[PDB]
């Protein structure tokens with residue numbers, strides 16, 4: 001493609017520093033397993049991909065490796081096989097916009113993750129954010145323009161400051177797969193109403209969109225994904241237009257004394273001076289530990305949330321057993337749907353505590369309130385079917401136990417995934433090395 | 440007394456600017472009936488005095504007037520009548536440290552509010568904060584010295600920066616009136632655990648303290664009171680040690696062109712440049728806009744919390760009708776107790792969304808979670824007495840309508856007060872002209 005060059009090596013000894021800082025995101029390679037840490041999430045995502053496996057983010061250099069390796073994507077034995085669609089690559093690779101730019105957007109989205117297997121191979125690279133080129137920014141994904149148009153703030157007409165965050169908005173945002181209406185499943189961002197929780201909620205309701213039917217409570221669910229752009233705008237740095245880049249891609253001096261933009265997107269605190277120091281007179285120990293307070297305040301009210309929702313789901317599990325009708329459970333489901341949605345959005349983004357604490361907290365208030373209604377309605381309903389004794393929740397204090405409780409063959413999935421990892425990945429990169437994309 | 444001078448005119452034409460900006464708090468004469476504005480709060484204070492009349496605060500100048508006028512204090516006939524005790528004066532006049540210094544704490548805390556009616560006549564003034572003198576700062580009420588000592592921060596050993604804030608910590612706190620063990624009916628700030636919600640909750644629980652038994656729920660309750668200081672201390676400003684004074688009583692310049700210190704404790708945004716502009720480069724409209732947001736995030740959840748607590752109460756009311764045993768109800772009342780305590784502490788300070796909004800939105804979160812547990816227990820219980828349907832909640836959409844549902848004779852309370860207003864108060868002022876305390 002004449003506009004996208006996905007090979008990330010071309011621009012070394014050419015843009016020396018920027019390639020250098022970009023390659024140092026491989027480095028933060030810590031693979032924190034988030035279910036092992038909080039197994040409630042296994043039961044809230046009962047019935048659905050995230051029940052299987054969910055890790056915290058690591059560096060951009062692992063995007064492709066990580067999408068490949070994760071149980072959710074599966075072990076597909078051919079380009080027609082596999083639970084998930086092409087869309088999955090969209091935010092993992094600068095090969096995406098190459099496919100989009102030649103194939104067409106319609107030709108890129110059609111089929112399965114496995115189809116794009118061999119073609120989407122380079123990790124988040126230069127062409128993802130730049131008009132490479134040569135510097136200067138670019139959106140690269142047409143569906144992303146659409147979402148920015150949709151809230152009334154296109155890229156073309158933004159200030160230099162504005163854009164700095166939009167380039168991240170490409171991926172670090174809540175999405176869904178449209179609508180399965182023939183014409184999609186494209187990646188659309190639910191921002192037509194638009195970006196608050198709240199508005200996103202009415203959007204998905206109005207079109208009755210359901211991410212999946214919950215395995216226990218048979219509730220039509222929404223799943224939130226990393227709403228960094230949407231939560232940022234809500235935070236206090238957000239409203240001052242302190243961009244992603246100010247804190248995440250700061251300007252650092254070369255030894256020679258050349259000032260340039262750090263492309264190592266990780267912790268803004270490593271580069272403390274250069275990030276916070278720019279605008280704050282306090283110390284590293286102080287600002288660090290303030291954010292740790294927030295981190296812990298969110299964490300807290302977060303489990304509280306989870307604890308009711310887990311109790312809500314199983315309490316709905318028993319109602320169906322006891323003989324609840326479709327009509328009897330509809331409102332209890334709605335109430336659960338919202339509560340879990342508001343939980344999930346509140347914390348899918350790992351930096352919410354750092355970005356928009358207050359809002360993060362606002363929405364967990366909102367989630368518990370709704371979990372509340374859910375549970376008391378159920379309370380009254382289980383008694384009409386004769387049960388007036390609290391519902392027993394089995395031991396879910398471990399990933400394995402949570403995954404056992406839901407009837408999941410974990411020793412089969414991992415079995416199949418190593419097969420995929422050894423037999424099928426070698427065949428993919430092999431074909432990708434031969435493409436090259438050589439102009 | 441020798442250390443205290445309650446007459447506030449004395450030092451006019453002497454510290455003229457400082458008296459004139461002190462008198463100017465007479466200006467916020469605005470009485471905002473909060474019960475009118477939010478009648479749920481009537482139901483939550485059923486049987487307690489705050490259900491009669493609770494108004495938003497106004498000028499320090501009206502401090503004495505409003506403790507005279509509020510229905511809470513009743514209409515006493517003599518020095519030994521009325522529901523409330525002497526303590527209520529403690530934070531309304533520089534006559535308190537007089538009465539403490541002459542009589543002793545012991546001597547001052549002994550008996551009824553009415554008995555102090557002609558003793559306490561000067562409004563909140565110079566001697567409350569100043570070693571009069573002549574300027575310089577002073578604590579004045581010994582129960583404060585003790586509370587400050589309880590948290591690790593004695594006033595003597597305190598920095599100039601702290602003293603600014605601590606002089607307000609004399610009154611703008613959560614307090615309570617001690618045990619009643621023939622040893623104190625003394626004011627004490629519940630800080631031995633110390634200053635968190637949480638810590639205060641465990642303090643009160645550990646000494647089995649209950650401000651009153653809820654009329655509807657029979658729950659042993661606690662009342663939260665304007666904990667500006669405690670809440671301020673958790674907020675982002677308070678951790679940078681930006682003092683109450685820094686925002687509320689700033690430095691300013693007379694027409695003379697003289698740099699005194701602004702004694703009109705009212706609204707920071709009135710002296711915006713001078714207050715906020717000392718540290719922030721952004722604009723009044725932006726900054727007001729942003730606090731205005733937090734107010735609305737606070738308030739929304741304020742209502743979510745209340746609306747559950749209200750149902751919680753009424754539901755418990757019915758467990759009682761249907762013949763619940765004290766044994767069955769203990770687990771539920773402790774839950775409400777805790778649920779309401781937090782709602783209350785959270786929204787008890789009208790400044791909270793300004794000073795400590797993250798924290799206020801945390802505490803409320805944890806309020807709901809508690810009224811969740813409460814309302815689900817009550818559901819089951821109510822079921823075990825053959826109620827499988829929701830407990831109807833009577834029209835409480837008006838201070839009037841709410842107070843009537845509780846059984847309150849408001850026409851018989853306002854009439855009693857007008858005749859105290861009319862026929863007991865001139866007696867109180869006419870003894871304080873005579874008594875003078877003359878120098």
Ligand code: HEC
Nearest residue numbers: 011015018019022124125126128129135164245249260261
């Ligand atoms: C892959 C190895 C690369 C290379 C070679 C470059 N980039 Fe980026 N870049 C991004 C942002 C937000 C800026 C700052 C915008 C601005 O200041 O105008 C830059 C800047 C550059 C430059 C200009 C010179 C400089 O460093 O200031 C150059 C030459 C450059 N980059 C090269 C954003 C991103 C990304 C978003 C995650 C990614 C990925 C890259 N850049 C990758 C690369």
Ligand code: HEC
Nearest residue numbers: 028057058059062063066091124128168170171244248266
């Ligand atoms: C534009 C300046 C940004 C900024 C500031 C961030 N992103 Fe991304 N990012 C993407 C993916 C798939 C991941 C997870 C990778 C994995 O786990 O394999 C991330 C991760 C991050 C982090 C965390 C890094 C760590 O060491 O823990 C951070 C701080 C971050 N991002 C910020 C995907 C993308 C994109 C798709 C092409 C683009 C564009 C961006 N990110 C842009 C940005």
Ligand code: HEC
Nearest residue numbers: 057168172228229232237242243244247267268350351354
């Ligand atoms: C603009 C929308 C963005 C995006 C896409 C991200 N950030 Fe930030 N961020 C900041 C701090 C201090 C943290 C956490 C501190 C810590 O390491 O404990 C984060 C966190 C993130 C993450 C998660 C990081 C992780 O791997 O756990 C991500 C994906 C992320 N950010 C992306 C600092 C800031 C800011 C300080 C003013 C600003 C503004 C942003 N980030 C903006 C963004």
Ligand code: HEC
Nearest residue numbers: 467496497498501502505530563567607610683687704705
């Ligand atoms: C020390 C520096 C301060 C600061 C910053 C404030 N106060 Fe007070 N205050 C007290 C009482 C009983 C009231 C209510 C008065 C009434 O309604 O009759 C108040 C009121 C306030 C306000 C509201 C002003 C407005 O215009 O709305 C404010 C902003 C305020 N306070 C801040 C009691 C006391 C004291 C007892 C002697 C002391 C000391 C203080 N307050 C100290 C401070």
Ligand code: HEC
Nearest residue numbers: 236280281675676679681685707708714715717718726729
């Ligand atoms: C006068 C009414 C105001 C208003 C409306 C605000 N401030 Fe301040 N502020 C100060 C410091 C050190 C911080 C933390 C930032 C940092 O560490 O550099 C803040 C922070 C804020 C916020 C955001 C945090 C929050 O509480 O939500 C807001 C909304 C805010 N301020 C508004 C320092 C000072 C002062 C030094 C004496 C002065 C005075 C003020 N601030 C005054 C105000």
Ligand code: HEC
Nearest residue numbers: 496607608611667668671676681682683686707789790793
């Ligand atoms: C240190 C103990 C204190 C105390 C006792 C008070 N303040 Fe503040 N305050 C600030 C702002 C912006 C508001 C909201 C203004 C509005 O929109 O109405 C408040 C509010 C209060 C109140 C409530 C007064 C009322 O009638 O609503 C009270 C009693 C109060 N404050 C006392 C500004 C600040 C600060 C800016 C950083 C600081 C610090 C403080 N106040 C500290 C204190």
Ligand code: HEC
Nearest residue numbers: 054055056057066067070088090091171172175187226348
């Ligand atoms: C942008 C709209 C995205 C699309 C669509 C998908 N992903 Fe993603 N992914 C995106 C971001 C911004 C991040 C990091 C932030 C975060 O909170 O994770 C990720 C991360 C992943 C990961 C690593 C984390 C993990 O779950 O182990 C994986 C394995 C992953 N993404 C897989 C994945 C799949 C299967 C997708 C199709 C459903 C998919 N992603 C889409 C951005 C976006």
Ligand code: HEC
Nearest residue numbers: 236237240242246247268275276278279280287290675719
């Ligand atoms: C380039 C500008 C900029 C930089 C970079 C920046 N801040 Fe801020 N920050 C601000 C502004 C503006 C405010 C609001 C204070 C004000 O009104 O001036 C603020 C407020 C804050 C707050 C209070 C708001 C909240 O989050 O609750 C914290 C904490 C904070 N900064 C910490 C940090 C940390 C930690 C970093 C690095 C992760 C950082 N800042 C980097 C501009 C910046």
Ligand code: HEC
Nearest residue numbers: 493494495496505506509511527529530609610611614665
């Ligand atoms: C140790 C501090 C303290 C003591 C104790 C205290 N007050 Fe207050 N009072 C305040 C402060 C500070 C305010 C202003 C903050 C507010 O009311 O929100 C206030 C406000 C008031 C107001 C005006 C607003 C209203 O309508 O409530 C009245 C009336 C009042 N108090 C009465 C009382 C009574 C009665 C008692 C005893 C039960 C009492 N006070 C005990 C400090 C105190």
Ligand code: HEC
Nearest residue numbers: 450454457458461563564565568569574603606684699700
């Ligand atoms: C609500 C508490 C409070 C009230 C009431 C109060 N003061 Fe002050 N005053 C302060 C504080 C705090 C300072 C700042 C002290 C410093 O700068 O060290 C101050 C400063 C002063 C100063 C020092 C000079 C200056 O302006 O910095 C004088 C003199 C003064 N006040 C006089 C008075 C007089 C006269 C009254 C009664 C008319 C009074 N104060 C009432 C708290 C109070």
Ligand SMILES: [Ca+2]
Nearest residue numbers: 175176223224
């Ligand atoms: Ca989604």
Ligand SMILES: [Ca+2]
Nearest residue numbers: 614615662663
């Ligand atoms: Ca109390």
